[PDB]
Subunit: 129 residues, 6 copies
């Protein structure tokens, strides 16, 4: 099982999105795209106590945005995941590019896809072969 | 648009549907379907204690649903990882399986794959 | 070895699962699953009269199971007989589409009949998906 | 729209192009081409007696075209009649792989049947490809 | 590791394009398509001293066009290629009679340049793999 | 539209990025990236003498860049000339896979040559991804 195989081309301005643990797999990809000549900005949207690699890719890409959401021990997890789904859709909307990549749970990908859909900019989803 | 992991609907036999963290959400319908088609699937959700979800749902959808809740975020992940390896090992160790499907972070699949591989059991990851 | 057509398990909505000839065997479990997940699938089996199979099985698995048996005319070569199944089957999908709305059309059958069924469904914007 | 099984055009050598039921239609052009490119392909059509088709066409397109017509008993459920085709298929494929050598084998038919043949083929260390 | 797997159907008039060594892999494909009933015309665009299989596919398809470009040894290869990349777009535009399917096997770069030109005429094109 | 070979960005370790003829153009960025991510990649360009390209570029992008230029012989024609490149390919690949260990080998070139190199890499048990 390998990370999402992706093409190494100069797409231009790229928005590398990483939901939850997905940011780990996006780090190297974003890093590479930047090194090849792309102006990529990564976005990590997870729970407050789960932010990771913030420093690493902050030095690897042009701009690294972290949107930490409070892990509410009150409501149930399904509710909490719905907040991330919210923050996630919001951010991507204001941010709006030549390409947008993302690796997170299918549910959040579809949600972000419906967004990016309204602006023509192509998107790439994760793939583990 | 993007869709869940496309998977074949056949009678593989005994299947271990593994879901790490949020991945369990995507596995629920798949497991549910496989069970409905005639498979004897057992789902395994390995996440952090305050993140268990759909426990009730698939508990009624499959034959057996195992939840392994785990109490910086880096060492925390290695725990979820160890428990995931440990747990999966015992499964393949205390009974036979036909197919092992998992959806979760690549790192975790790369490791889970290693253990399952040791038993000659075919695996399928979220493609 | 070769596995059945890998397909996503999502709630597409109303799905038309088409099975030409022996293809219906492979579609049975798929349709069954989609229905179980929350889809309103209707299967369509178009084969020769003496080849209808699994009629009872998926009749209980999905909301509606349509069987369109076409006679194997003994006074005609298989090429003709064959072209007849294509015909009927094409009249059926068109009849289905132009009478009810759908979200997805999945069909597993001979490449020949797939290109035909598609020539129609594309006329209604409904997305289609075949085997692999 | 839907296209036939995309396949590479190389000189594999001796190829056994298998077509079960209506699948032979899709294999005809493929076999024809492989032969034209320099391959020594032999096609095998295993269907029901009253369903043999294109026999003359590919008989002129490839080196050897084998037709194995199975009796279609309209008085048995199709599940039975299908077993026969299955059996015959495993028989002839075994009989062929037992006698002569082969560099490649390609098939296009029901998934269930592709599994059966495959398991046999894999016994004689010869690579195989199936439709997609 | 096999040649580009391609469908054997009667698309109609097909333009089989082969850049540089790519023509070797296209030869059998074109040959086959023609044999199946297609009216394919192959195009080989390479450097003058690299034309190959000219006679072979000249007999296999309806029309085989060879566009040889000179090799200037007083500049880097990136430049010489540009000429080849120019002849490509200049020839594909010319041929764009009425076609049903265009197929090409050659350096990715040119595959994109030929794509923009063809995309213009709403003609289906398939690359290699 | 058409894009370069999509490839995973992981730390495989020591990687041999092979580029035959014009294929080296497409491999350059891939190798460059893999190196940047933490891989110890060595690129190999095997083409005709008057076709070497990007030599300077990836020489600075990866740990080691090997160029094996094969002279043209206007007598053998372009048939035995290519097969003359398939020779250098197999041989160099054989020296590398034999004098060193590699975690993965990647190549982008004419399928014909991809098969050759493959039959060679299979012998030494090394994974290999194609374009």
């Amino acid at each position: 099982p390998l990370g999402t195989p992706v093409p190494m081309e100069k797409f231009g301005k790229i928005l590398a999105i990483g939901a939850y643990t997905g940011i780990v797999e996006v780090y190297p990809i974003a890093k590479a795209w930047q090194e090849i000549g792309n102006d990529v900005t990564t976005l990590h949207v997870t729970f407050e106590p789960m932010v990771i690699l913030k420093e690493e890719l902050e030095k690897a890409v042009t701009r690294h945005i972290v949107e930490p959401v409070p892990l509410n021990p009150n409501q149930d997890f399904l509710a909490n995941m719905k907040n991330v789904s919210q923050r996630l859709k919001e951010k991507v909307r204001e941010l709006l590019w030549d390409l947008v990549f993302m690796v997170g749970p299918v549910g959040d990908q579809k949600q972000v896809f419906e967004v990016v859909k309204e602006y023509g900019v192509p998107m790439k989803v994760d793939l583990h072969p």
